[PDB]
Each structure stands twice: as structure tokens, then as C-alpha cells.
Amino acid sequence: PGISSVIPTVLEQSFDNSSLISVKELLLNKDLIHPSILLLTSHLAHYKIVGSIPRCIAMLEVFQIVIKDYQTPKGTTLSRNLTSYLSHQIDLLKKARPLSVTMGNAIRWLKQEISLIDPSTPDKAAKKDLCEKIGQFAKEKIELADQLIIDNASTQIEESTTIVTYGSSKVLTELLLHNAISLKKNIKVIVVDSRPLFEGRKMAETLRNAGVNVMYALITSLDTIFNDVDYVFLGAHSILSNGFLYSRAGTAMLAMSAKRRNIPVLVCCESLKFSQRVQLDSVTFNELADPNDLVNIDYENPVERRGNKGALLNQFIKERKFEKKKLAMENKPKGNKIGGKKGSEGESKDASNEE
Amino acid sequence: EDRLQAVVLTDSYETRFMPLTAVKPRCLLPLANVPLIEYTLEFLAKAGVHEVFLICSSHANQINDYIENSKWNLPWSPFKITTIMSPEARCTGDVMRDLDNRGIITGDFILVSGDVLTNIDFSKMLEFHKKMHLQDKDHISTMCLSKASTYPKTRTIEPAAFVLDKSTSRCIYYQDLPLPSSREKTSIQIDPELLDNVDEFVIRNDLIDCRIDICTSHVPLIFQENFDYQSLRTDFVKGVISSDILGKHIYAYLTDEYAVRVESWQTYDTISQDFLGRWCYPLVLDSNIQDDQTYSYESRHIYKEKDVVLAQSCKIGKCTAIGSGTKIGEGTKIENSVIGRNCQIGENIRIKNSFIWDDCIIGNNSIIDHSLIASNATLGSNVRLNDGCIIGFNVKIDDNMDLDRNTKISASPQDLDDQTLAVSIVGDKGV
Amino acid sequence: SIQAFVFCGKGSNLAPMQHSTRLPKALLPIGNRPMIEYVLDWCDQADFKEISVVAPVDEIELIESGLTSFLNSNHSHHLQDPKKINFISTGESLQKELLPRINGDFVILPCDFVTDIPPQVLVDQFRNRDDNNLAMTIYYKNSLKQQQFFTVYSEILLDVYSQRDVTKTKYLQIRSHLLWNYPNLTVSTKLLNSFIYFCSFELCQLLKLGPQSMSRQASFKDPFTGNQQQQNPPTTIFILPNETLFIRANNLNAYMDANRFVLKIKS
């Protein structure tokens, strides 16, 4: 069935809103789960590349594989044990890593498609049309929509400009790659990074592989790099009903500085990224991770040192707690580039009612 | 543990730098507007040297006069410099026998071939040398090594492969390979005399040579005994390992931090770019070691000394350094390039990845890309240069001149094209 | 797609037990326990339902009787005896014969096995690191000579050279192209392969066309070199083997070391 309860590190006096636990190394499980799910859960547990956008694309493709592998039983119909099996997938995904908003909209789309198709049509004729529709759905809402974001941003950015970024957002990597190659401008790109994940490092590496003038920096040193900077792009995860920017770690700090130092913040987003859940502070619902990623002393992810820190459980109160997903304040960002072209974050939910 | 004497191998890698070393010596040349010897001497002072030796023969008078002017002839200095005068151009083995005949070597001495800039603390090195000397009696010399830039695919001049112990860190084999530049040889033959004595064999090519040595009193006696050995690495180390005297050991030291010996032009270019960057944390221009230096750090890795004069509406780049008493005209782009002290610069000049030493005048409307200029040499108007184009001392290039890739210019007024006098072989001129 | 293979044979290196027709190499008590019991215990832990066992011309029903009586098994085993094996062909000809039975990625493990290691973590490493081959190295005794030499990379962890000193010349020889790429190399003397092999699906395309494999060790993993010439048609991931180091005692039994395994169990 799975492993539940018994967690590493202290329960903590401050910040205990979410689960801090889960299965990394495979021991005691059901022998019916599709291995492509088991691969993705093992991926997302210790992932370095993904950040909101790519997670759903992989989740869709895994689902497409499952349907292609799905053969309808002779006794039980198509809508009998499928939805239970999908619920087992999501529960295993939840155990590995808390889901994104875009993942939820995908599940909601899939559950709508199950109800749409009645058990009367032949099995091979059904799944052939289904995967074709999902492919077209992923083409429209992601790939084509992404291209629409590309060209919307293209008109907005001035010739020969300096851009500071953060994260590992798929949309922005392709944005800057488009700027360097197709448009041919003088784009100075500065990338910032945190401690838990070297997301920006990977982005800078990929930008270097394209051949871009790249500076690479950290949160600690900003009042030096800014004093240069024009437009700041932020990797969206979810924009809520109010218009608060729920995104990764070192995002809000950058957002504040940019608002203070004249030239503002811009955000690229998808029409699938918007939710209806609302909050106002970072404490509300945080994506907490185990302090195992913060054990390492600088430089790289695997170093293995006999350093200063090591104990967490036996130590009399030593909460080395880090967070992953934060909230930028409402007023600070200015532009959102989506499927429906443009709109300020003050407007926010003009897409949720438009559907 | 105290009292340490050092010997510096100068007059060693001359003419390895092809267009230069004609009138002035090898080590006089500036890396960051300051002589290469000064870096080495700073390394000596940080190590804790009480007595300094130098090997000068070719252009020895200019070296001796520079030491006279140096900060170490003055009484307060922790070390005193004494120069060794030898016959013109000889191998390292010949100098070793000369020094043993004179007999000044006491206990543990230091030998450095070439000029090396490193941020690595030497106090740790001395302790681990002494700890390993106390392990067994017949133990000789210490070698330094540092980790390379992941893959040494651009590093062709130093193809040294090292076989090392995981437990005792003893070197087993040294080998040079033509591999990527000349695809001819593939094979490497290793002696199987030391198979079960070591067991934990580790073969690596991903290590940079340093040629910095901590040596015992045994070394000069061995050089006189075996006078067939000319080199100190290629034949000597291999000779020591391959059962010359049974039971004798030599060290190999691994260090994570930056340590690169200067040898070639394109290695020199990388070290210089590393110095402009913050690779050598202590060794930075702003700290000022030569005392006359007044460099100040500016954000985005831009270095400026005191009395820097610059025209309005001019753009400066990344990892750049400009000397004192320097004037620049309008429409200038300075990107990843070093310009020396007291250098006057004209107008509309685009510079990328290039090099200019002290007291150089550049003519108006000229583009210089990844190419080097020596001291007291003038560039004319309408000058276009390509990658790896090294220009010699006092070379006056006249107006309207175009030179392609790797066009080296001679410093003395022999066999290669372009000389020192006006219109350098674009119309036959030159002594 | 996932399936395990058990390789059974007959021993010629051992002195006394194996020469008799009734007793095979698979059914031998070492430390008051059968030999193939440890292989079945490993496969039960690793969670495998599809296991097929290969057998030589000798002992056709003696292995089948051993699997049914006494042995916990609880799995459907497919035992087959091909006739092409001549002993002089050992296992590579057996591998070339049976190929349509394998649907995806397959695991090769001989009958001569002693194991004291976690099984699932080896399978997880094969699945995650995304490559063709994986091998295991284990230390020799430490309690109170010319053998074989392995080369290992340490940061991704890979295998390069595994050739023995039987037909090796006077001097140790290395190729430049195989050294310049992968510049860091660690040569092992004490560490030995305990016959653990993991393989991918794409091996089926080459085994029917070009017979090159020998002894399941010499020319089994050695075709991987993307160096110098590069002429053999690849299946589309670069052809690269892997290695992982272990401290615990688990090794092969073929020579005089079989008596030392009895001394290892009784302690």
C-alpha cells in the first residue's frame, strides 16, 4: 500500500502548516502501479531542472503512455477501476512532491474526458481518438500558447537591453534563446540563485551553451549588481485570484528591489497556471522540503564533507528550515503575458471566468 | 622548522616565447602591469624564505639592476637576494652541479622553475612534507599539483599524465602526448615493477603542472653523481622511480585551489584572464603589492589605478584593467583587455580580448582583437588584427596596416616576417 | 519488459562432487545450505515474476526436481536445455539462441552466487542512471600477486578496462583516445567482479547479426568504445558501462575459494 508517518528532523515550533516527510528508495509497495509514474516520482523527489511548467508536460506524456498501454477488461468497463488507479497515481505523486496548479487543471481535464466518453464504443477506436485529443490539447494550451508568449514579449523588450532573471522556467529559457538567436540583440543576462537548488546555474549553463553574455550571482549580493538593470523576468508558478505571485524562493526579494529601483518586474505565464485558491502571506501553504539538501557545504549538490553541521534530531533546537515556494506582493509586478495576450496582475481573474 | 633558503630557476624557458626575450629577459615581462618575478617573490615572502638565490646569465645585467631597484635590497626585508652567474644557456642539471660545488645548501631547500602565481598557503605543504619525511629516511623531493578545468581539451602544451597512490601519494609515471594536435601516437608503456607495492593505482591527465619543489640535501649530491640527467621532470623523476637507488621516495601533492605555472602564450592569456577574474582570492590588483600600485576595484570586474583619464560617452567592458597616467579618447570599447601604465589612446578604437603593455600609443580608428602588444611600441591609424598576434618591443606600425592570424613580429632589428623599423615588411625595410 | 535470467552450467576448475552425473553444480551445500537458494532469495527480494533459467546438455530434470522439492519459491520458472552448447560455447551461444522470449530490459545472473547485499538499490541505479551495462566490484580478504585489473571513474561512475594478465604482454599499455576523454582513472587490484550484470532492450538487434561475444566477459562489455574509427552501427544513448563499489563480502565460487566460503559462513 505504501509507507506513511515517521519523519526525519524536529516537528518545529514555528511553521508547521504542511507535510515535511514518503518513499525515495523503493521498499514495500503495490505491484500494479505503472513504472512511468514510479520513474517520475523518483525524478521529482530529487529534481534539479523542473519548475512548474515542465512538470505537467511530463505528467501528460506519462498519462498518454498509460492510455496507450491500457487494455479494457472483459468484465469491468473503462470507467470502473481507471479513476481509482489515477487516484493511486496522484496519492503517490503527493507523497513524493506536492503538486502544481497546472497538474490539477490537467487531472480535471482528464476526469472530464472520462465522463464524456461512454462505455459503448470499441476499445482500440476509443484510445486512438483520446490520445490524439490530449496531443492537440497539449499542443494548444502549452506549445502554441508558449509561442504566443514569446512574440508578446518580443514587442515589449527594447533593443540592446539588460535582463535579470531567476529560476528554471521553461518559458523564459526559450524567451532568452529566441532573443539571442532569431532577433540578434545585445542582451546582457544576469542570473540569480539560492541555496537549496542551483536552478539558475542550470539556466546560465544552457544560456552559455547558446553563447550569451551571462553574469551569475546570488541573493546575498544584489545592492552591488543593481548599482545596470532594466527588465526583470520572473518564473511564474501560479497567480491567484487576488493577483499575488506565488513563485519560487528568491523571487520576492528581487521584486522588491526592482520596484524600489525604478525599472519594474515582468512575468510570463500560462492560461493553465491560474487558480482560484487565494492567500496573502508565505506562511499559508508552503512547499516544505527536508533539510537533507542543506547539509552540503557550498559549491555543488554532491560534495560529501566532514564539516561543521550534521546533527538535527539529537541537537537541542536547531531548526535549519528552508522554504521553496513564496509569495510576491500584489502591486510590485506590472505585466503578465498569457494565452489571452496581456493584462496587469490587478486584473488577475479575467481568465478564470473566460475559461 | 625555521630558516628556509630558496633557489629560483630563471634563464630557463627563454625563446619558448617566440617573438620576445630578444633584448630584455624572460621574467621581466608584466602579467598585470607588474613583472613576473614580483609574483614569485610575493609567494616566497608568504612561504617564509630567509635567503634567496637567482640564476641569471642571458641579459643578467638588467636583472641585477632590477634587484638593486627592488624592495628587497633594503635592510628590513625578510630575505636577501644573491645572484648566480653562469655560462650562457645551460640545462638545469648543469646549474645543480655548479651550486653543489659552491656548497650553500643546508637541510631543506626550495627550487622553482618558471614563475608561478598561486593563492595556496605553503605552511600546510611544509608540514606534510615534514610528516612524510619522518615516515621513512630515504625521501627526496616534493611536487605540487592542482585540479584542471574539468577537461584539458584546450591545454595541449602540458599533456603530462600522472600515476599516483591513493594512500601515500607517490608518483609512478610521467608521460607526454601529442594526441589532439598531432594524431600519430596512442600508446603509453608502464613499468610493472611497482604493482603489488602500491595496489591502489590512480591514472590521471586532469592535473596541471606547477614545477615548484621542496627538496632535501640529497638532491645536489645525486646531480653530481649522475651528470647524465639534464631535465628535472621528464627524465629525472622517471629515473628516480625506475630503481636507480632502491628505497627512495618522491612526493606528489594534490591541491584543490588555483596554481598554474607560466610557460606558453596561450597559457599566459588564461592565467591573466583568471587574475582579472576573482580566481586568485588574495592575489588581486586592488591590494597593491609593488607599493607604487594604486589600483581600485570597481563592480563588474573593472580595475582602475589612480590618475585614470577617460573621455565622456565611452563604454567599458568586463574583466578589464587600466594603469596609471592613462588617457583615452572618445568612441572606445574596452572588453576583457589589459592596458598598461602611462598609455595614451586615440579615438574610435574597438578592443576585445586583447593585450597592451606600458607606454603605448594607439592611432585613431583601429580594431584590435585577441592580440598582444609589448612595451614602448606604437600602433598607427587603421590597424586591424586577429587572434594570437604578438607585437614586439618598440615596434612602430605605420598607418594603414592589416595583419592576419598568428602574424608574429620580431623584437630585434631574423627568420620570421615583420620587424621593428617603419613599414615592417610591407615594402622592404629592416636591419 | 523486466525479467531475470539464471545461468546454470558445470564446473571444471574444482578438484574433487561435480564429475558425478547425479550431482550438478547448481545443487551444492556450502554452509549447510543449497547454492541456488541464495539466487531464489535475491529474486524474491528484487520482486520479479518472470524468471527463465538456462541449462546445459547435462542434467535435464535434476534442476527441475530441485526447484519443486524443498524450495521458498512461489514463482513460475522456465527451465530449458538447448543442444548447441559444446562446453569448449559456454553462455554467449545460449544468449544468441534465446532472444524472442525477452520483451524489454533483462538481468543476467549465473548460478554460482553468494550474496549479502541489498538487491533493490542495484535495480534502481540501473533504471535511473540511463545506460546499457552495470557491474559490481567487491574486496578481497584482509585477515591474516598478479591477478586482474579494473579501471573505474569516480565523481556518474563507469567502467572502461577489465582485461586480465593471462595473455597480457611485458608492459602495461593504454590508448590515448580512451584516456583523453575520461581523464580521471582509478585502477583496482583487490576488487573483483562477482558476476552481476544488468542489460537493456537494444542488445537484441546486434546478437543475431554479428557473433563477437566470448566467455560472457571478454567481448561482452568491451564493445562500447566510441573512439578512433567508430564503425559498428549503433542502436538509438552512448554505449557506456557502469560500476559501483561495495564493502560487504559477496563473490564468485569456481576455484579453491569454495573452501574459504565455508569458513566465512561458520563464524
Side-chain angles (χ1 to χ4, degrees), chain A residues 1-2 8 14-355, chain B residues 1-178 180-181 183-290 292-431, chain C:
Chain A
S14 299
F15 286 74
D16 59 300
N17 58 94
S18 61
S19 300
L20 59 94
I21 322 149
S22 69
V23 278
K24 296 174 188 177
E25 294 266 50
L26 297 166
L27 191 77
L28 294 157
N29 275 106
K30 282 182 176 185
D31 296 295
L32 53 92
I33 316 297
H34 196 99
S36 72
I37 285 97
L38 288 153
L39 179 132
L40 196 71
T41 50
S42 296
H43 262 280
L44 289 153
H46 287 270
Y47 225 122
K48 290 182 188 181
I49 325 157
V50 295
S52 71
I53 318 100
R55 305 180 207 175
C56 75
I57 308 158
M59 206 271 195
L60 279 150
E61 288 192 300
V62 159
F63 254 85
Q64 287 174 323
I65 287 299
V66 169
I67 298 154
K68 277 186 177 177
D69 281 301
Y70 186 77
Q71 205 72 62
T72 315
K74 292 171 183 180
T76 50
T77 46
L78 55 95
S79 58
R80 207 96 278 173
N81 210 56
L82 166 79
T83 182
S84 182
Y85 195 88
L86 314 188
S87 288
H88 278 292
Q89 293 165 347
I90 298 151
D91 278 318
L92 279 155
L93 285 152
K94 280 176 186 167
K95 280 188 275 173
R97 192 195 176 93
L99 330 171
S100 80
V101 170
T102 48
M103 289 163 83
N105 250 290
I107 296 153
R108 279 214 211 100
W109 176 255
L110 291 149
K111 284 189 176 178
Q112 197 185 299
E113 289 293 311
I114 299 154
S115 62
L116 272 156
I117 284 94
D118 60 310
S120 61
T121 51
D123 307 318
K124 265 218 161 193
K127 64 166 188 177
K128 203 169 183 184
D129 284 61
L130 279 155
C131 279
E132 272 179 55
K133 280 176 168 182
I134 301 151
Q136 285 293 307
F137 190 80
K139 195 183 172 190
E140 309 166 2
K141 279 210 176 183
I142 315 150
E143 203 164 68
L144 297 172
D146 284 14
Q147 289 179 249
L148 298 166
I149 302 152
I150 302 296
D151 61 62
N152 283 329
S154 299
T155 51
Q156 215 149 320
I157 305 154
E158 281 188 59
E159 314 287 311
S160 68
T161 37
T162 316
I163 296 158
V164 177
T165 43
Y166 192 80
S168 61
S169 53
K170 201 203 176 168
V171 277
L172 291 182
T173 53
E174 284 180 294
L175 213 310
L176 303 152
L177 219 88
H178 182 94
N179 297 310
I181 299 155
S182 71
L183 292 153
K184 286 168 186 163
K185 292 178 187 182
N186 302 316
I187 325 103
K188 288 173 197 157
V189 181
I190 305 152
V191 201
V192 206
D193 209 287
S194 60
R195 256 219 69 185
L197 282 85
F198 284 89
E199 296 160 53
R201 197 193 212 168
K202 194 152 280 195
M203 192 186 276
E205 277 277 308
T206 52
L207 291 157
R208 194 210 84 261
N209 285 308
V212 181
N213 295 56
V214 178
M215 295 172 223
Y216 174 76
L218 297 150
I219 332 129
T220 50
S221 61
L222 289 172
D223 287 75
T224 42
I225 195 75
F226 283 82
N227 291 325
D228 310 305
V229 181
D230 294 289
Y231 325 122
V232 177
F233 281 96
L234 277 171
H237 170 93
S238 57
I239 308 166
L240 323 161
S241 301
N242 264 65
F244 283 106
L245 190 75
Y246 190 84
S247 61
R248 264 138 271 165
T251 49
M253 309 280 292
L254 278 162
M256 179 192 277
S257 60
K259 188 74 191 160
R260 284 219 186 269
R261 304 152 213 269
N262 310 306
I263 316 155
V265 155
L266 287 86
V267 170
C268 295
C269 183
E270 281 84 82
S271 61
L272 205 83
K273 282 182 157 173
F274 297 94
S275 61
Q276 283 223 53
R277 189 194 71 169
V278 222
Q279 64 217 328
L280 285 95
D281 53 74
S282 298
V283 196
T284 50
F285 212 96
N286 182 74
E287 213 163 305
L288 270 157
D290 301 65
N292 298 312
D293 292 299
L294 214 78
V295 174
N296 298 301
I297 314 297
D298 303 60
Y299 314 98
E300 289 176 63
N301 295 284
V303 280
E304 291 167 296
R305 273 185 160 189
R306 201 188 291 174
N308 194 43
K309 279 186 183 163
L312 274 143
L313 288 147
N314 288 303
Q315 283 293 310
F316 17 79
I317 312 156
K318 199 185 179 67
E319 287 157 42
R320 288 137 69 175
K321 283 272 183 173
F322 68 94
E323 301 159 300
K324 283 183 166 180
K325 269 84 195 285
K326 326 295 156 85
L327 203 88
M329 289 180 93
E330 212 288 311
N331 65 287
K332 296 165 184 189
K334 287 193 179 176
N336 286 309
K337 296 155 193 178
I338 55 143
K341 201 188 179 172
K342 294 178 186 173
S344 70
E345 217 156 321
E347 312 157 26
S348 63
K349 46 188 172 193
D350 281 285
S352 295
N353 288 33
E354 195 210 63
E355 291 168 54
Chain B
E1 291 172 306
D2 54 73
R3 275 213 149 204
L4 292 156
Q5 60 170 76
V7 186
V8 189
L9 271 149
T10 45
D11 303 53
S12 53
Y13 301 98
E14 277 174 294
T15 61
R16 210 181 202 272
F17 305 99
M18 213 273 195
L20 295 190
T21 68
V23 192
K24 282 203 172 196
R26 192 202 82 96
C27 305
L28 200 140
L29 309 175
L31 171 81
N33 307 341
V34 56
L36 230 68
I37 322 141
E38 303 289 303
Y39 291 90
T40 328
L41 287 152
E42 203 201 317
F43 174 68
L44 298 167
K46 208 165 181 188
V49 180
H50 298 262
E51 206 164 60
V52 169
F53 293 93
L54 266 152
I55 305 150
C56 61
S57 187
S58 60
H59 321 278
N61 302 58
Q62 294 175 308
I63 301 154
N64 284 38
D65 273 62
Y66 228 93
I67 295 153
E68 281 174 62
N69 301 316
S70 81
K71 325 275 155 204
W72 321 115
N73 271 40
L74 299 137
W76 56 71
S77 60
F79 49 84
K80 280 222 162 191
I81 302 162
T82 45
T83 46
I84 294 100
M85 282 167 277
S86 62
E88 293 154 297
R90 81 256 62 81
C91 296
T92 59
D94 297 296
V95 197
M96 279 301 290
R97 296 153 216 164
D98 282 323
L99 223 149
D100 192 50
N101 284 315
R102 291 180 194 187
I104 323 102
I105 293 150
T106 48
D108 288 290
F109 81 98
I110 315 145
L111 189 81
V112 189
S113 57
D115 294 48
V116 199
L117 53 145
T118 180
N119 61 333
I120 295 155
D121 291 302
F122 206 77
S123 59
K124 268 175 185 173
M125 290 209 73
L126 277 152
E127 281 282 297
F128 275 98
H129 168 76
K130 200 147 190 154
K131 275 265 185 182
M132 284 297 285
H133 192 89
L134 285 157
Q135 279 274 263
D136 198 64
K137 285 189 177 180
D138 282 292
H139 276 238
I140 324 149
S141 62
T142 326
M143 282 192 286
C144 317
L145 287 163
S146 57
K147 279 91 180 185
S149 180
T150 322
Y151 324 104
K153 73 268 190 173
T154 183
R155 191 196 70 182
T156 50
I157 320 293
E158 322 97 80
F162 274 81
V163 191
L164 315 170
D165 203 321
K166 204 176 177 81
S167 60
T168 53
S169 73
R170 206 185 87 98
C171 178
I172 301 148
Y173 206 83
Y174 192 88
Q175 189 58 57
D176 300 297
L177 287 153
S181 58
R183 197 261 297 158
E184 284 169 60
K185 284 185 187 172
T186 50
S187 60
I188 302 101
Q189 280 189 46
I190 322 151
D191 289 290
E193 276 196 53
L194 300 144
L195 300 166
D196 286 295
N197 291 297
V198 178
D199 281 301
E200 289 178 306
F201 275 75
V202 183
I203 304 159
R204 284 175 73 175
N205 193 57
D206 54 297
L207 287 152
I208 326 152
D209 295 68
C210 303
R211 289 210 183 189
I212 310 151
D213 298 291
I214 317 155
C215 296
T216 50
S217 293
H218 300 266
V219 195
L221 290 153
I222 299 154
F223 266 100
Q224 270 208 40
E225 187 194 297
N226 294 298
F227 58 92
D228 56 294
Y229 292 95
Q230 302 288 301
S231 189
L232 50 90
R233 276 257 184 155
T234 51
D235 297 298
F236 197 81
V237 177
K238 186 203 159 193
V240 164
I241 296 154
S242 62
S243 67
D244 199 63
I245 307 102
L246 282 91
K248 279 196 175 176
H249 303 263
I250 43 98
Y251 311 120
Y253 201 88
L254 303 155
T255 331
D256 294 59
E257 290 195 64
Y258 194 89
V260 184
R261 52 174 287 222
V262 189
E263 47 215 307
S264 74
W265 285 117
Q266 295 220 299
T267 49
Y268 167 84
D269 180 56
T270 53
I271 303 154
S272 67
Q273 282 190 242
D274 292 325
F275 197 87
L276 290 155
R278 290 292 203 108
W279 268 108
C280 319
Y281 170 70
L283 288 158
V284 192
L285 283 144
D286 76 319
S287 61
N288 307 305
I289 308 103
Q290 210 197 45
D292 298 295
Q293 295 175 303
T294 42
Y295 297 96
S296 57
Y297 199 92
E298 289 161 50
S299 59
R300 303 162 89 259
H301 293 259
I302 303 144
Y303 298 93
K304 278 177 183 176
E305 212 160 9
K306 275 194 156 200
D307 301 60
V308 162
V309 185
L310 216 142
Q312 214 176 316
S313 72
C314 300
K315 40 211 141 186
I316 28 85
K318 303 149 170 194
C319 304
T320 52
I322 303 154
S324 62
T326 52
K327 289 195 197 288
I328 306 156
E330 274 200 295
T332 45
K333 287 190 191 185
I334 303 155
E335 294 164 67
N336 203 83
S337 43
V338 182
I339 298 158
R341 282 163 157 260
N342 292 311
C343 294
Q344 203 155 57
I345 298 153
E347 292 186 53
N348 290 260
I349 295 156
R350 278 85 192 264
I351 305 155
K352 285 160 162 165
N353 295 98
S354 305
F355 252 92
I356 300 144
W357 284 341
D358 302 300
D359 282 288
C360 301
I361 308 155
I362 304 150
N364 304 291
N365 298 261
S366 54
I367 311 150
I368 309 151
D369 302 301
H370 204 84
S371 36
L372 294 92
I373 290 97
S375 61
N376 276 298
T378 51
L379 286 152
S381 61
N382 293 291
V383 176
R384 201 177 153 190
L385 289 146
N386 286 263
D387 294 56
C389 300
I390 308 144
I391 301 155
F393 297 108
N394 301 291
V395 175
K396 189 182 274 179
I397 295 151
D398 211 65
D399 308 298
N400 284 292
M401 246 138 267
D402 185 62
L403 287 145
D404 290 297
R405 290 171 194 168
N406 295 288
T407 45
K408 292 173 189 187
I409 303 163
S410 60
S412 59
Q414 286 189 60
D415 294 297
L416 60 147
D417 292 66
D418 294 54
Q419 283 182 54
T420 48
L421 283 156
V423 289
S424 59
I425 312 165
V426 278
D428 294 68
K429 269 191 172 182
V431 183
Chain C
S1 59
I2 46 101
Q3 54 195 103
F5 268 81
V6 181
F7 175 70
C8 188
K10 205 172 91 178
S12 298
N13 302 303
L14 282 148
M17 279 278 279
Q18 289 84 45
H19 293 268
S20 188
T21 49
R22 286 190 183 97
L23 294 163
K25 205 186 182 179
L27 291 148
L28 284 162
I30 312 297
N32 293 301
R33 279 166 171 265
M35 195 187 281
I36 51 153
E37 193 271 302
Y38 301 97
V39 190
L40 288 154
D41 185 59
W42 195 96
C43 289
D44 190 62
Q45 284 170 304
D47 296 298
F48 276 94
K49 290 169 187 178
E50 295 172 64
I51 304 150
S52 188
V53 189
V54 285
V57 281
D58 282 64
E59 55 273 315
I60 195 149
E61 284 194 299
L62 290 157
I63 315 155
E64 282 179 63
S65 62
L67 290 156
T68 49
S69 63
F70 289 92
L71 298 156
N72 294 301
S73 61
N74 278 303
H75 294 104
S76 60
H77 280 258
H78 220 90
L79 194 277
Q80 276 278 308
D81 303 62
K83 287 159 194 174
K84 283 186 190 175
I85 322 140
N86 293 300
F87 287 91
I88 50 99
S89 298
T90 46
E92 67 281 326
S93 294
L94 270 144
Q95 200 179 300
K96 283 181 270 178
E97 280 176 79
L98 294 163
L99 281 157
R101 280 183 183 177
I102 313 148
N103 293 64
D105 297 46
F106 60 97
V107 186
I108 313 154
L109 301 154
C111 62
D112 37 65
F113 255 78
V114 177
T115 41
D116 290 298
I117 51 152
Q120 296 93 253
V121 290
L122 326 169
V123 190
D124 293 322
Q125 278 167 55
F126 168 71
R127 286 175 181 175
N128 279 250
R129 306 203 104 161
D130 197 274
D131 264 289
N132 302 62
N133 204 291
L134 172 70
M136 297 296 160
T137 41
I138 287 96
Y139 293 96
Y140 187 73
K141 275 189 182 73
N142 300 300
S143 61
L144 287 152
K145 284 185 177 181
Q146 194 181 296
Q147 287 165 300
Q148 56 189 57
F149 292 94
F150 282 93
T151 59
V152 285
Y153 171 80
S154 60
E155 258 201 56
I156 317 152
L157 294 144
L158 284 93
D159 193 71
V160 176
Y161 195 88
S162 62
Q163 292 157 54
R164 284 210 279 264
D165 307 299
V166 184
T167 185
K168 148 261 183 189
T169 51
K170 291 170 187 175
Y171 284 90
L172 295 145
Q173 286 176 245
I174 342 145
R175 287 188 175 179
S176 65
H177 274 86
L178 203 58
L179 209 150
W180 267 76
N181 204 293
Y182 300 94
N184 206 312
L185 289 149
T186 316
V187 186
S188 303
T189 316
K190 289 181 276 176
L191 290 148
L192 301 151
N193 260 45
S194 62
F195 282 86
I196 304 158
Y197 294 96
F198 287 88
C199 295
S200 61
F201 165 73
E202 291 174 306
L203 276 83
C204 296
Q205 282 83 57
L206 282 89
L207 279 153
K208 288 164 178 168
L209 291 158
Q212 287 169 308
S213 48
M214 273 290 288
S215 70
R216 280 189 174 181
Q217 271 196 303
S219 50
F220 168 80
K221 55 204 271 181
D222 279 62
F224 77 97
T225 54
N227 299 265
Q228 285 183 49
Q229 288 178 248
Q230 298 167 249
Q231 59 182 113
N232 200 289
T235 47
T236 49
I237 312 145
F238 218 95
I239 326 147
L240 304 163
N242 297 68
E243 265 277 2
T244 322
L245 286 82
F246 279 95
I247 313 101
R248 268 275 164 94
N250 55 300
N251 277 314
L252 71 147
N253 44 82
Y255 290 91
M256 282 82 256
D257 292 296
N259 293 295
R260 277 89 181 179
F261 274 101
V262 190
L263 297 155
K264 274 186 166 181
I265 294 157
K266 281 98 174 188
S267 60

